Ligand binder design. Sequence first.
Ligand SMILES: O=c1cccccc1O
Ligand SMILES: [Zn+2]
Length: 257
Amino acid sequence: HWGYGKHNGPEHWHKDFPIAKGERQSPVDIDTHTAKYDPSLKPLSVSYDQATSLRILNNGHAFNVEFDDSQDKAVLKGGPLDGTYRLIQFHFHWGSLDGQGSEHTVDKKKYAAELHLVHWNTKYGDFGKAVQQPDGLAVLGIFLKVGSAKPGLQKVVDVLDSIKTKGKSADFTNFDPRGLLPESLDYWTYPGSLTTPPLLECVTWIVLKEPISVSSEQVLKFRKLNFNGEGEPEELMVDNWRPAQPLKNRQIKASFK
Ligand SMILES: O=c1cccccc1O
Ligand SMILES: [Zn+2]
């Protein structure tokens, strides 16, 4: 099945998921010079103070921190959105080396990692219905640069030893995702897709301008995870990023001048 290696990676995905070659694929390069300021965009509204994290899961391609999305506990609205979107999970994409790992790029620059906070449009009832819709998801993407530690990430780093292999999970209650956010909520936005199979074109992407800094030790710990299952040959979970896709004349809008 699909992965990130030479024989099952991004170049191969189109065979099983032909939408890989679609008109609104992600990620993209964000060319800042050609992203137009849109004064009709609203500020983003991030309402996470009642977030209820549940669990952390190594799914074979990343680690997901899952939330209770059966009520409006942690929601995203405003910005480019015209609905309420409920947080279901966050995860990261990252590199084998600090100079690569993000999915989006900014003027062709790669960050060491990218955080995705995944939300679904509550008018569709459930995540599974939302992913059948062109406005079903909103993903808040945040770049990670290596520098100082991010204290609000450390609780995630600490638990990774307990979910080293595919299919492992651990309780992860009482995690506050607000400690993963940068100061500014200035963003770019464009219509796109999931960046992993099934690559569905459901996503309003909201990419924050301001990176967060994480330490070299924090990202090192991410790189000790495994793609494989327990008892299988060890394959370090690194370079789980899709490269930038053709923009296909979409326009990226900026909330800021
Ligand atoms: O950002 C994501 C959102 C939803 C599902 C799968 C994979 C992803 O990388
Ligand atoms: Zn992702």
